Design a protein around this ligand. Structure first.
Ligand SMILES: *[C@@H]1O[C@H](CO)[C@@H](O[C@@H]2O[C@H](CO)[C@@H](O)[C@H](O)[C@H]2NC(C)=O)[C@H](O)[C@H]1NC(C)=O
Ligand SMILES: *[C@@H]1O[C@H](CO)[C@@H](O)[C@H](O)[C@H]1NC(C)=O
Lengths: 62, 198, 97, 48, 199, 110, 110
């Protein structure tokens, strides 16, 4: 069992990788300079104040 | 170096920039936009009644002398200058209790072709936070960081909050910015509210 | 402001900030001193020392820094860095540190 | 508070008049923004 | 002062204090070093810091500061600010508080042969790892490591000072003027010059 | 000697410490950063502060500080005060209560 | 203050603060030193350090800072910064952990 996730940063050109997990995640937060979006595998535990979106479909984190 | 040095020589030697003069007419006020980022909360000493903070203060203002058209300088769109070369509003913490009014590290300013000046000095500040001991050790405290200019009055500068944008709509940043990913909570103090006011 | 710059250059041509303003020899400089207590920080008894935060209020007259406002587009006040003008050497005499 | 170097023949001192004026002899405390010390109460605050 | 001012003006013509004195290439500036301890202030064990009051005697020679006394009315010595001459940037490497440098930048004494004498005083907080096994009946071996911050062994030759025929391989202590520390007695006080051969 | 003096006179005749030292403003400055930890001074658990003694080695190339050694008596390396030149503004981002940037401006080897 | 401005400009136009203020280099500078004790702050018996508040009155004649008052409107006494003149380098030899010399450069009465 495998899956295709996205992993690019923010508004960079899209890239993909092979997740061995059953979810792909998008992680959004905002520091003083602007908004950061991190994409990857699984469903990580995030610190408070961070938007998280986990999804169980191919190419689902964008 | 060529366009950078050319632009510096155009702005500061050819135009004869004077850092002692405000970037405004004599009867006009300069709009300073302020935001605060709390890097980390060091301590609140109860006996000494002192809040210690690491804060990055973001100052923005338009200087109409420090502007250029990018097409005459090789499409250069940003310049980094020492803070000692430009006019500064000289924003200080009036609430300090140790005499350290000023920011800690006087970093470079960033100037842009529009004449906008961006400055993000970091600072370590010791301020007076009066302590309410009534419900100790189940107490909560209300500390403040009061920023103003002792060199200029309301006629000379006008303080305001930073205006950020979301989906093309502007809003004033009415809170202390804390980076959620990089913030480490203080060992004994949790933060409940972070408002900001003019 | 350009007129502010010309006024500043006019006032500080030949101005020495280390020289007390006295138009005649024997003239006194009348300095008026007040104080505003922002915060009474502490009274440390073991050190016998009172810590305060204050704002001084120092008023005097420098005859060298006068101008006609109608000759400079109505400018009647200036904000000049303290190192550029003659200051009275007012200090707290009974400081403990 | 005094001039460290200049003597009375050069710099003459006087008490600072407040916005009230009228030959004040007092330390000025702005009553709105002044938080009293938790250990100390200011009974008198003159100036001479 | 006219001869002194004349000599200073003639000496400071074209003098760069930030350039090491070398008359020919591959010249190494010899620097002799002596340390006088005036009082051992303390040894804080919880910070592992030895606080000491020292006077460091540095002697080197600068060919650019040479002059003939007969051309200047028999002037045989000149007191110059230490900022205006070239200096070997000797620092206490093992400092615990971040103060590498001397406390007071006094005058140097330049002689007609160009040989410069400098005796700045210093307060030094140095790192002393405390061996705690026999506390409070313990003895400690504290170190003060002095080296150039910027120059290498092909540029300066840092050595111990030589008095009349004998190298001073110890911390000098005034017998008359020394007041013993109230908690520490100095049993040995040697000095060494270390140069790793493979460095 | 006179050759080191002549060299330093020429290198800092038309030098600008504010300008990034590259030929073209569109290329970045390449800085190599290394950290040497000399001593772990203290770990303080209450305020969550680690104080350490470090050396912060920084290596880059200044385009405007080149010379031919044959025109200066064969001098290949010199020592310059760091205040005279452009430097990277390295800052400890997670600084707690210490210094954000370098305050001890020692000499550079050029 | 035009007279005093003229005098101060005249006095420090050819003045060198490094060498001693003596017409001939073979005569010594006569300095009168007095100590005023304002406050005995502390006696530290452990570290054996006495902390005191003092004023260090130093008096001496500068050969090149003389003038005729008739050429300057009758100005006989002035106050000048101490950093721009030669001074004695008075050091406290038995300084424990404070300042070896004067660090607060108040005004000179001339
Ligand atoms: C610089 O110091 C070195 C020692 O570190 C001196 O070298 C020796 O000096 C003795 C006495 O003059 C000679 O007998 C030896 O032959 C020297 N050895 C070497 C390494 O040559 C050296 O002379 C000193 N230089 C100056 C200019 O005084
Ligand atoms: C900058 O970019 C514009 C894009 O239209 C181009 O026309 C121009 O030649 C470029 N260079 C300069 C120096 O303006």
């Amino acid at each position: 069992g495998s899956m295709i996730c996205y992993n690019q940063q923010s508004s960079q050109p899209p890239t993909t990788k092979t997740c061995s997990e059953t979810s792909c995640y998008k992680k959004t937060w905002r520091d003083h300079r602007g908004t950061i979006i991190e994409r990857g595998c699984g469903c990580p535990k995030v610190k408070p104040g961070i938007k998280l979106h986990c999804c169980r479909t191919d190419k689902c984190n964008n | 170096l060529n366009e950078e040095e050319r632009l510096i020589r155009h702005l500061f030697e050819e135009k004869a920039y004077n850092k002692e003069l405000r970037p405004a007419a004599h009867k006009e006020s300069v709009e300073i936009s302020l935001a605060l980022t709390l890097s980390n909360l060091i301590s609140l000493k109860e006996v000494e009644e002192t809040l210690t903070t690491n804060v990055w203060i973001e100052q923005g203002w338009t200087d109409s002398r420090l502007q250029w058209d990018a097409e005459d300088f090789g499409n250069i769109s940003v310049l980094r200058l020492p803070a000692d070369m430009v006019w500064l509003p000289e924003i200080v913490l009036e609430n300090n209790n140790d005499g350290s009014f000023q920011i800690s590290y006087s970093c470079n300013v960033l100037i842009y072709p529009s004449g906008s000046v961006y400055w993000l000095p970091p600072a370590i500040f010791r301020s007076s936070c009066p302590i309410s001991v009534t419900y100790f050790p189940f107490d909560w405290q209300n500390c403040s960081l009061k920023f103003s200019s002792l060199k200029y009055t309301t006629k000379e500068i006008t303080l305001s909050l930073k205006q950020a944008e979301e989906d093309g709509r502007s809003y004033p940043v009415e809170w202390i910015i804390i980076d959620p990913e990089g913030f480490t909570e203080n060992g004994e103090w949790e933060i409940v509210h972070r408002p900001a006011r003019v | 402001s350009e007129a502010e710059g010309r006024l500043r250059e006019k006032l500080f041509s030949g101005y020495d900030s280390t020289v007390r303003p006295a138009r005649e020899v024997g003239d006194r400089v009348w300095v008026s001193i007040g104080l505003t207590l922002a915060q009474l920080i502490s009274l440390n008894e073991k050190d016998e020392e009172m810590s305060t935060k204050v704002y001084l209020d120092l008023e005097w007259t420098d005859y060298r820094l006068s101008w006609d406002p109608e000759e400079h587009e109505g400018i009647d006040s200036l904000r000049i860095s303290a190192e550029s003008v003659w200051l009275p050497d007012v200090v707290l005499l009974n400081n403990n540190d | 508070f005094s001039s460290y170097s200049y003597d009375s023949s050069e710099v003459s001192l006087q008490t600072g008049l407040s916005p009230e004026g009228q030959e004040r002899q007092e330390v000025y405390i702005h009553e709105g923004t002044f938080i009293e010390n938790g250990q100390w109460e200011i009974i008198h605050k003159p100036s001479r | 002062r006219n001869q002194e001012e004349r000599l200073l003006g003639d000496l400071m013509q074209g003098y760069n204090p930030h350039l090491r004195p070398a008359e020919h290439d591959s010249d190494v500036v010899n620097v002799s070093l002596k340390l006088t301890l005036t009082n051992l202030i303390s040894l804080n064990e919880r910070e592992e810091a030895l606080t000491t009051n020292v006077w460091i005697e540095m002697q080197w020679c600068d060919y650019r500061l040479r002059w003939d006394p007969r051309d200047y009315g028999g002037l045989w010595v000149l007191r110059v600010p230490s900022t205006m001459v070239w200096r070997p940037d000797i620092v206490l490497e093992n400092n615990v508080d971040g103060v590498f440098e001397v406390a007071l930048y006094c005058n140097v004494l330049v002689s007609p042969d160009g040989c410069v004498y400098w005796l700045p005083p210093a307060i030094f907080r140095s790192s002393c790892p405390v061996s705690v096994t026999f506390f409070p009946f313990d003895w400690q071996n504290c170190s003060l490591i002095f080296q150039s911050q910027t120059y290498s062994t092909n540029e300066i030759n840092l050595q111990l000072s030589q008095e009349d025929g004998q190298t001073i391989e110890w911390i000098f202590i005034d017998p008359e003027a020394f007041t013993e520390n109230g908690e520490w007695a100095i049993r040995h006080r040697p000095a060494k010059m270390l140069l790793d051969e493979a460095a | 000697s006179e050759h080191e003096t002549r060299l330093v006179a020429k290198l800092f005749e038309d030098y600008n410490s504010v300008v990034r030292p590259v030929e073209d403003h569109r290329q970045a400055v390449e800085v190599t950063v290394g950290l040497q930890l000399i001593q772990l001074i203290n770990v303080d658990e209450v305020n969550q502060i680690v104080t350490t003694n470090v050396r912060l080695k920084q290596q880059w190339v200044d385009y405007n500080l080149k010379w031919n050694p044959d025109d200066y008596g064969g001098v290949k390396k010199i020592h310059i005060p760091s205040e005279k030149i452009w430097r990277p503004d390295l800052v400890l981002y997670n600084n707690a209560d210490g210094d954000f940037a370098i305050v001890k401006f020692t000499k550079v080897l050029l």
